[PDB]
Design a protein around this ligand. Structure first.
Ligand SMILES: [Zn+2]
Ligand SMILES: [Zn+2]
Lengths: 191, 185
């Protein structure tokens, strides 16, 4: 009898959630793309203000990348709400392209009342220069980036997936993939 | 450089650098000894194999140590540059033994090139690399050039060029970053 984030969204299939990662090597193709976001105030102790899921089958074109959809939605949301300081969390399934990173950064500059934390499930094209730069572009703008570990997948399952009481069911390579991807992110950001 | 070379298919299958790999129970170690002289030709060169299963004494790192001891008697006290090309990174028990060795004998500098990190997600095996690095061993992930040198020197490729498998540089990037992360601070 308390306000849950699950009630504030249209939750995704378990299948839409895990099909990209479950028993699939880091260097794979994709079935879906998603971005689960959460909005809070300065105080992390507070209750979650609002949340939304941007999902779709893979390879939308630039304009409909979940990151851009988020920016359109959150630009209006900021206007239809009290002005204070907000902290935004993303759980996003794929790597930001350069075009999304630039639009997000410019946003972060015009609206310093907002800080952004990004959890990425899997890096892609991390060997391509533009994708590496996109990560640095976001860090430069003050966005915080981390790879999703068990807790984050678990949390994202609890808040955003149609789980039906059922618990998060981790795949075997999840911590292995995490270590590899977290080290690679770290590397791309420093160098 | 007369080694008893390994078979092409043994190479391609054991030095494949997918980070997460099953069905490779064998560690392969190709080694080269030189004088600290950067010009000095290969003194000797050997190939050791060992199942990664129980006896850590039958790991190719251990076998190398004994061989290198007898070898270091048959010949003269001088400065040695050892290089390794190994298919899995050292288990924690071999790390200790190799560390100890390098400590006692300071006129030998070891450089370990690694195709894959063994249990990189496990804290105990992460410590192994830290131990080796403390003892002065240079740790590096094998990239194209190292796979190619290992091919030329240790494989029976009948003149044919080293040919890269799918995703060699992509796997490299993952592994090298991971190694760097594990040796930070
Ligand atoms: Zn994009
Ligand atoms: Zn061992």
């Amino acid at each position: 009898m308390k306000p849950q984030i699950r009630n504030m969204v249209e939750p995704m299939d378990p299948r839409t959630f895990v099909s990209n990662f479950n028993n699939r090597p880091i260097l794979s193709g994709l079935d879906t793309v998603w971005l689960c976001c959460e909005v809070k105030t300065k105080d992390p102790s507070g209750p979650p203000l609002d949340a939304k899921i941007f999902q779709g089958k893979v390879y939308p074109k630039a304009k409909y990348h979940p990151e851009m959809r988020f920016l359109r939605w959150f630009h209006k949301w900021r206007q239809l709400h009290h002005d204070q300081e907000y902290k935004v969390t993303w759980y996003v399934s794929w790597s930001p392209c350069t075009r999304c990173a630039n639009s997000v950064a410019t946003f972060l500059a015009k609206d310093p009342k907002v800080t952004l934390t990004i959890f990425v499930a899997r890096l892609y094209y991390f060997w391509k220069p533009d994708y590496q730069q996109a990560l640095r572009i976001l860090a430069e703008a003050g966005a915080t980036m981390k790879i999703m570990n068990y807790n984050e997948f678990q949390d994202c399952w609890n808040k955003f997936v149609d789980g039906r009481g059922k618990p998060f069911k981790p795949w075997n390579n999840l911590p292995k993939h995490y270590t590899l991807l977290q080290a690679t992110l770290g590397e791309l950001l420093r160098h």
